[PDB]
Amino acid sequence: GSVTHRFSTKSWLSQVCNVCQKSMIFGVKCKHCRLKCHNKCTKEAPACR
Ligand SMILES: [Zn+2]
Ligand SMILES: [Zn+2]
Numbered sequence: 368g369s370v371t372h373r374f375s376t377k378s379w380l381s382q383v384c385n386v387c388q389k390s391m392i393f394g395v396k397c398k399h400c401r402l403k404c405h406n407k408c409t410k411e412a413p414a415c416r
Contacts (some may be wrong), residue, residue, distance in 0.1 A: 372399045375390050376406070386411040 377394040384393055384405040393405045397415050404412040 372397045377403075385397060 370389075374395040377396060378392040379394075380392060380394050382394055383389065384391065385403045386405055386408040388400050391405075392410075395404050395406060396402070397404070400415050402415060
């Protein structure tokens, strides 16, 4: 079928990117593995195991 995980958007308030970690509120939820990362930051964040 497809091994592509679907990401979602989230922005609480006091949350920080789990990749570059900076002043902002950007987060993405990856299923199959369950991870959090900037709106994208794919260049920094690793590959969804
Ligand atoms: Zn980031
Ligand atoms: Zn995943």
